[PDB]
Each structure stands twice: as C-alpha cells, then as structure tokens.
Amino acid sequence: ANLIGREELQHARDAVTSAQAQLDVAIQQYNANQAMILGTKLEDQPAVQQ
C-alpha cells in the first residue's frame, strides 16, 4: 500500500536471510559431533572397545 520506506523492508528481508544462515551454521555444528556418536549403544563405541 506504499506506507513505509523501502529501506525498512530491505532490512527486514536481509534479517530473515541472515537468521536462516545462522540456523544453517547451528545445524551443521550439530551434524558434526554426531559422526562420533553414530553407534547407538555406549558399550559398542570404538573408544570403549579398544
């Protein structure tokens, strides 16, 4: 309806995109350190068997 400035909407879209990027970073941080805990059971982990 042409009420608010365009730089305000630009800054809103940029914020949403940045938040998406940060969530991707967090998900990736989780995916790593899940490669170590692949085995379901604690007694079957490679370190314990050694």
Next chain:
Amino acid sequence: SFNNINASISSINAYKQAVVSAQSSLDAMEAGYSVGTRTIVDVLDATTTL
C-alpha cells in the same frame, strides 16, 4: 508608520530564508524516498511544511 515599514522589510527577509530552508528539506526528503530510505508519509510532511 515609518518604523512599521522597516519592520515589514525585515520580516520579508526572514520568511524568504525560511522558504529556502523548507525547499531544501523537501528536496532531501524526496531524493531519500526515491532511493528507498524514507516512507511516503515523510514526503507528505515536508510538502506541508513548504
């Protein structure tokens, strides 16, 4: 009366300067809205002030 005349001259000068200042403010607002940094509401107020 002779003094009222000079008073009027001075007031004319002052209001001319005020008009120039309002013109400059309006132009700045219009350019900012053209590039997207301001809302249409801001432009309407500068036009009213001019």
